[PDB]
Design a protein around this ligand. Structure first.
Ligand code: CDL
Ligand code: PC1
Ligand code: PC1
Ligand code: PC1
Ligand code: 3PE
Ligand code: 3PE
Ligand code: 3PE
Ligand code: LMT
Ligand code: HQH
Ligand code: SF4
Ligand code: SF4
Ligand code: SF4
Lengths: 318, 144, 178, 156, 52, 115, 56, 69
């Protein structure tokens, strides 16, 4: 009965990941005054499945200069960590209930940067090495602020358990007492997931395709499934943390439906953002995060350390 | 209110193709279920519609026949299947359909259109249309 | 007369009213929200797409497309092998041979257009004194082999008979501009 | 037979996936590449056929030769074509690519991209209108639809 | 640009390579009704520049 | 045990898709296909040569700040102490010297990338 | 043009412009695709006299 | 038009609700119609182990009330 419960997590997520590729191509379409896919199936609904099938019948590439062990490991790691980020998410009851879920999300997210690094390095190509060394630069940019932002929000929550955020937001979104951190949190998630205007590791304009330039076929498909799963998860995580869905102990179906509506809406804003802005320069990404966000995040960390103290609003341990 | 008018046009388009079979046939062949005015039809079976309220470029369109010259074109439609009389109207090179301004008849004009025959056994094959230039000597057929 | 695109240094003083506006611009990302608005407005505009191949892009009667050899209303070929289309062709795309016919007429035994040399300039259409060679309105004639794009006389006369109904009306709509 | 029938429908299945996802390589040479950008423009929106431009030849299915191929660029065009994973298709677009075009007699021009790579579809014009290229692209999908790889494997 | 290509085609018959300006003048005169369409496009084009 | 099961299931899917990708397609290997990519021309040198890091000082400053995260992450448990004055004073100082350290590096052109 | 008045208000406000007055799409204000025949004028050397070529 | 985006946006929506609803129900189906007991601290884990021992069927979720004394 637990195996059936994995099915009803990993399969709906994978289906939802695929259609995000369709929603991306049609929202980008209509925002660009065109229609996006709409021939492959009714309104393109079969277009995601065509792309998947075609990619797994495409010849896979084994470049002569490549380090095969890491070349193969990297896409496999990418998609594993994308699916593993989901098992602790409470919706409103998580598949795996962890006391330090927030750290499991932080630690799993960091380890997924090594799929970019190892793949790029293992390709033994100049454009793939440029892409990898932007993954290093991008992580050094957003890592420090992203952890501290979480610390600030969790001092109103009382613990690193994700399931306790449901109870913190019983009467109010954390977005209100924390909208400065949500603004900084949201931009971090665009950097965490290599999403425009921060698609610097890929960055088709400057690097031909960045880290995955030497990847074709099914191995390259796994990288994308990982990229789009993370988009849903990071916005799903942002919905739990800051936009707490309605939770009634008698209507757990209500929390999921409301959780989905806000997660879909936030996922759309990622697609909305990609259609609206030019791409950052990856040196300027560091300056954004270290010279703007970091000074503000440290101050808000000190604000939220003191805030429960001088209002006697310390969250409970349990 | 306006939202209801929109659903009115939506219903009117869903039921305006003659049954469920009609709506599925048009929707999966053209991926479009608008309701134009039938402007005419050709000897091959293409139907020509128009709606001048649409913006220039979608105000005229053709639903290709499902069988032309013995080929099955239920799914395989290509723009070369429009004959030359409608080719001019369909491309907005004029303003009046052939049903009201027919082309001048000629005895050499093709009666039966022919679409792109590339890849098929009807395909054109180039060759030289001149005759031999240098004529060779023919030896006697007898001993000397 | 000239104008400055990026000059504005008629420096004003930063009022507390104005400084707080600069800060709200920077902290609240206001100009970046304006850009999000412009792409949101486009989402609710009707797309400019047309439903090809069921809908076609507009064309004019002058459109320079596929070539064709025309006839007179009696069915006689218009081409008299003058070779002026050949002398003008910028691409040397036309090859012609001629001789007296069986009835004595001046007619071509060969007439080729290598449609892979042609630049579709329409100059042959202008040079022809009897409207024999024209560029019809066809543009959907891509092939699966190079050799199918070397048109000899039979192919070009066949295009003439295929498209005459439409060619004749385009000349009727445009010859007065020529 | 039953197996020969099943192989036929499996053939349609794999073809359909390749017909419905053609990813041309971001790659144009001269003025013909401007009309290829118009086919991507809103009016024609090749994306609605499942046609997405991808920069890397590893991720690309189709190479559209959209402009003149000079001798200096001939080896490089072949190299990016070799690096395309198979199956892979070439659309030759324009007189320059088709056979040299306006530069057929130039000392520096390859008289047709089909001396360098195998070409599937030839699109005439200088340039072909975006619809002409679109007709050619859709004529490549029908060519794939006629593919019979699985059935031929069965009869080997 | 797709609309400006329409003005190129209505005078010359080609969307891009018009071959329309020639030593001594232009090849053909404007077709009737072309200046209205150029004017209709021009009255709206500054809004397009504004959006960009 | 559940958390071990769900992750093997994740790994097996990633493995299973990896095997299908390599043994399902029809592969035609030759030298010119499997050479590295570099925009159509041959690479002029291997990609394993040194690649100068213009942000190296920020890289090692990330390490120092990374460990200063490890000191602030116990705070959610620390605000449960009776010695609230102490907990708060230590917290304020810790964040303030991280800020003072950051200001010094910022003013020393330390955040600037080496040209 | 076919857009409801609610979506017109939404997209006018989001853009900050009056889109309805200046639409990207073309409807009826275009020229008719079949115009009457022209009658183009001759040039200044279409005279019958006083028009020797060597003087121009 | 823009509402043609909805068919895919609606599929994605249904997909994202199956995880939450299926997990909530599966927990009730494997825990006697009750929420899966959460054990954050050792004390709560002790209560589950005691409940497992006094149930009589070696399942912590088979509660015994005043019927049993
Ligand atoms: C649950 C929802 C998610 C599920 C998605 C599917 C449901 C679609 C959304 C609801 C219907 C709305 C459509 C509509 O408005 O009708 C107008 C539309 C026609 O009206 P119109 O002429 O375009 O006029 C509208 C204006 O152009 C332009 O009008 P507008 O842009 O101003 O907007 C109109 C209106 C529409 O907004 C709404 O959502 C209501 O928006 C509003 O006024 C504000 C919203 C409140 O109706 C349709 O086109 C019907 C499309 C569906 C036909 C299905 C064809 C049969 C295929 C069957 C087999 C395959 C099926 C798929 C298998 C999987
Ligand atoms: C992974 C999920 C697979 C499900 C999708 C496979 C079905 C593909 C056919 C389809 O959906 O569209 C109808 C398609 C559409 O035809 P079409 O592709 O030729 O039409 C396209 C051109 N217009 C837009 C003008 C219509 O029908 C076919 O021709 C292909 C049928 C093949 C079905 C596969 C064999 C059965 C499976 C064994
Ligand atoms: C997602 C997964 C999508 C797959 C859906 C099922 C379709 C499987 C069809 C085979 C995949 C395509 C492989 C291919 O094209 O090669 C054809 C090959 C080529 O046939 P061949 O043996 O005649 O080719 C010989 C090599 N040449 C031509 C170069 C001389 O045919 C097969 O052997 C495929 C066998 C299909 C049996 C299904 C399991 C295969 C594993
Ligand atoms: C899903 C794909 C699994 C089925 C195909 C496995 C390919 C394979 O190993 O063939 C058996 C192998 C042959 O592997 P192969 O090299 O022919 O794999 C290529 C697969 N096709 C044919 C579809 C292109 O048989 C052996 O000789 C060793 C066992
Ligand atoms: C690459 C492979 C994927 C790597 C995944 C990396 C992320 C894993 C982080 C470690 C998970 C963790 O933090 O353990 C939490 C949990 C302990 O449970 P706890 O937090 O105390 O709350 C309930 C206790 N009553 O832990 C437990 O319940 C038991 C320990 C589980 C450890 C999970 C190990 C993952 C599987 C790795 C397999 C090897 C990969 C090859
Ligand atoms: C009672 C006590 C009160 C205590 C709390 C006080 C809080 C006050 C409010 C502070 C809000 C802080 C939010 C962060 C704002 C910020 O840092 O933005 C500035 C940043 C710098 O941009 P820059 O080019 O450098 O211009 C300024 C020159 N330094 O510029 C940027 O950030 C731009 C980043 C944009 C990247 C694109 C992201 C998409 C944006 C749209 C999504 C919207 C959702
Ligand atoms: C998938 C596609 C998206 C799905 C959702 C589409 C929902 C469509 C139906 C929404 C109906 C909204 C009614 C808008 C009413 C209106 O006319 O807007 C006017 C209003 C401002 O009024 P105005 O007079 O123009 O200016 C005065 C300023 N004080 O302007 C406003 O205040 C409107 C502000 C809220 C509008 C939200 C609608 C955008 C929905 C897309 C979300 C982003 C997707 C990415
Ligand atoms: C070199 C870096 C230095 C920069 C950083 C300096 C930080 C200095 C912070 C000083 C703030 C301490 O603020 C101090 O908080 C404590 C407890 O929180 C308050 O103390 C009060 O509350 C505590 C419990 O909370 C009671 O037990 C106590 O009797 C009462 O006095 C003090 O009234 C207040 O003055
Ligand atoms: C990003 C993805 C997409 C789908 C985009 O929408 C479009 C379709 C891709 C574009 C823009 C280019 C595609 C191929 C290519 C490399 C063209 C050559 C080119 N490119 C030019 O500029 C960009 C020129 O500028 C004067 C040129 O002369 C030439 C010759
Ligand atoms: S259109 Fe130009 S290039 Fe083509 S055949 Fe005529 S004169 Fe030659
Ligand atoms: S087609 Fe016209 S120009 Fe060419 S040879 Fe014949 S008559 Fe002369
Ligand atoms: S065929 Fe004509 S349009 Fe195309 S590249 Fe050559 S010169 Fe340019």
């Amino acid at each position: 009965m637990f195996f059936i419960n994995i099915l009803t997590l990993l399969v709906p997520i994978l289906i939802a990941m695929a259609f995000l590729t369709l929603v991306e191509r049609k929202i980008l379409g209509y925002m660009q005054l065109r229609k996006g896919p709409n021939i492959v199936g009714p309104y393109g609904i079969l277009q995601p499945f065509a792309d998947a099938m075609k990619l797994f019948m495409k010849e896979p590439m084994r470049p002569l200069t490549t380090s095969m062990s890491l070349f193969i490991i990297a896409p496999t790691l990418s998609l594993t960590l994308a699916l593993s980020l989901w098992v602790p998410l409470p919706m409103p009851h998580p598949l795996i209930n962890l006391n330090l879920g927030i750290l499991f999300i932080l630690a799993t997210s960091s380890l997924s940067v090594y799929s970019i690094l190892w793949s790029g390095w293992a390709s033994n190509s100049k454009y793939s090495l440029f892409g990898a060394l932007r993954a290093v630069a991008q992580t050094i940019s957003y890592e420090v602020t992203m952890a501290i932002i979480l610390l600030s929000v969790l001092l109103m929550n009382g613990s690193y358990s994700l399931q306790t955020l449901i109870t913190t937001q019983e009467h109010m979104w954390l977005l209100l007492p924390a909208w400065p951190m949500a603004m900084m949190w949201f931009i971090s998630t665009l950097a965490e997931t290599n999403r425009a205007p921060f698609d610097l590791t890929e960055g088709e304009s400057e690097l031909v395709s960045g880290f995955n330039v030497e990847y074709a076929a099914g191995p390259f498909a796994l990288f994308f499934m990982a990229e789009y799963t993370n988009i849903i998860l990071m916005n799903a995580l942002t919905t739990i943390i800051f936009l707490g869905p309605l939770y009634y102990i008698n209507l757990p179906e209500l929390y999921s439906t409301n959780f989905m509506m806000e997660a879909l809406l936030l996922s759309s804003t990622f697609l909305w953002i990609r259609a609206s802005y030019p791409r950052f320069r990856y040196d300027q990404l560091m300056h954004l995060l270290w010279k703007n966000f970091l000074p503000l995040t440290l101050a808000l960390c000190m604000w939220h350390i003191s805030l429960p103290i001088f209002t006697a609003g310390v969250p409970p341990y349990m | 209110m306006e939202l209801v008018e929109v659903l009115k046009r939506g219903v009117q388009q869903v039921t305006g193709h003659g049954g469920l079979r009609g709506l599925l046939r048009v929707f999966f062949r053209a991926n479009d279920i608008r309701i134009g005015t039938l402007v005419g039809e050709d000897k091959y079976g293409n139907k020509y519609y128009e709606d001048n309220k649409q913006f220039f470029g979608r105000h005229r369109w053709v639903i290709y026949t499902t069988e032309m010259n013995g080929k099955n074109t239920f799914w395989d439609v290509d723009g070369s299947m429009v004959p030359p009389e409608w080719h001019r109207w369909l491309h907005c090179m004029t303003d009046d359909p052939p049903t009201t301004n027919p082309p001048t008849a000629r005895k050499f004009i093709w009666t039966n259109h022919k679409f792109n025959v590339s890849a098929t056994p009807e395909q054109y094959v180039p060759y030289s249309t001149t005759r031999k230039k240098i004529h060779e000597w023919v030896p006697p057929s007898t001993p000397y | 007369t000239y104008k400055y695109v990026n000059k504005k240094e008629q420096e004003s003083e930063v009022d507390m009213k104005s400084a707080t506006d600069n800060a709200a611009r920077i902290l609240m990302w206001t100009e970046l929200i304006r850009g999000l608005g412009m792409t949101l407005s486009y989402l609710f505009r009707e797309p400019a797409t047309i439903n090809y191949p069921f809908e076609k892009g507009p064309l004019s009667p002058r459109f320079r497309g596929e070539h064709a050899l025309r006839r007179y209303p009696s069915g006689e070929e218009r081409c008299i092998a003058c070779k002026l289309c050949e002398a003008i062709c910028p691409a040397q795309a036309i090859t012609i041979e001629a001789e007296p016919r069986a009835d004595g007429s001046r007619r071509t035994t060969r007439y080729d257009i290598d449609m892979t040399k042609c630049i579709y300039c329409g100059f042959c259409q202008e040079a022809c004194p009897v409207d024999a060679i024209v560029e019809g309105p066809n543009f959907e004639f891509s092939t699966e082999t190079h050799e199918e794009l070397l048109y000899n006389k039979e192919k070009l006369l066949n295009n003439g008979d295929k498209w005459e109904a439409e060619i004749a009306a385009n000349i009727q709509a445009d010859y007065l501009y020529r | 037979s039953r197996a020969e029938y099943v192989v036929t429908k499996l053939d349609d299945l794999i073809n359909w996936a390749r017909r419905s996802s053609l990813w041309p390589m971001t790659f144009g040479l001269a003025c013909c590449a401007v009309e290829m950008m118009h086919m991507a423009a809103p009016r024609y929106d090749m994306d609605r056929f499942g046609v997405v431009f991808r920069a890397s030849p590893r991720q690309a299915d189709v190479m559209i030769v959209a402009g003149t191929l000079t001798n200096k660029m001939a080896p490089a065009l072949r190299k990016v074509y070799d690096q395309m994973p198979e199956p892979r298709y070439v659309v030759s677009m324009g007189s320059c690519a088709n056979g040299g075009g306006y530069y057929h007699y130039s000392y520096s021009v390859v008289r047709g991209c089909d001396r360098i790579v195998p070409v599937d579809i030839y699109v005439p014009g200088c340039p072909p209108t975006a619809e002409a290229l679109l007709y050619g692209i859709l004529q490549l999908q029908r060519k794939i639809k006629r593919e019979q790889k699985l059935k031929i494997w069965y009869r080997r | 640009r797709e609309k400006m290509f329409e003005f190129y085609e209505r005078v010359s018959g080609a969307r891009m390579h018009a071959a329309y300006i020639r030593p001594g003048g232009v090849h053909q005169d404007l077709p009737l009704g072309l200046l209205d369409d150029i004017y209709e496009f021009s009255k709206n084009f500054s809004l397009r520049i504004d959006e960009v | 045990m559940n958390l071990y099961t769900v992750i093997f299931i994740n790994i097996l899917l990633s493995l299973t898709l990896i095997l299908v990708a390599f043994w399902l397609p029809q592969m035609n290997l030759y030298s010119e296909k499997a050479n590295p990519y570099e925009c159509g021309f041959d690479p002029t040198s291997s990609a394993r040569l040194p690649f100068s890091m213009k942000f190296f000082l920020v890289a090692i400053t990330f390490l120092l700040f990374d460990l200063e995260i490890a000191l602030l992450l116990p705070l959610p448990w620390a605000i449960q102490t009776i010695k609230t004055s102490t907990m708060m004073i230590m917290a304020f100082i810790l964040v303030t010297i991280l800020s003072l350290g950051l200001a010094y590096e910022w003013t020393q052109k330390g955040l600037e990338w080496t040209e | 043009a076919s857009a409801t008045r609610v979506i017109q208000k939404l997209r006018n406000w989001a853009s900050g412009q009056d889109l309805q007055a200046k639409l990207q799409l073309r409807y009826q204000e275009i020229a008719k695709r079949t115009q009457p025949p022209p009658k183009l004028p001759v040039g200044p050397s279409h005279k019958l006299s006083n028009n020797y070529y060597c003087t121009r | 038009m823009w509402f043609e985006i909805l068919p895919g946006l609606a599929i994605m929506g249904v997909c994202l609700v199956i995880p939450g609803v299926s997990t909530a129900y599966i927990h009730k189906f494997t825990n006697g119609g009750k929420e899966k007991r959460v054990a954050r601290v050792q004390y709560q884990w002790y209560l589950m182990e005691r409940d497992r021992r006094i149930s009589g069927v070696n399942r912590y979720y088979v509660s015994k009330g005043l019927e049993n004394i």
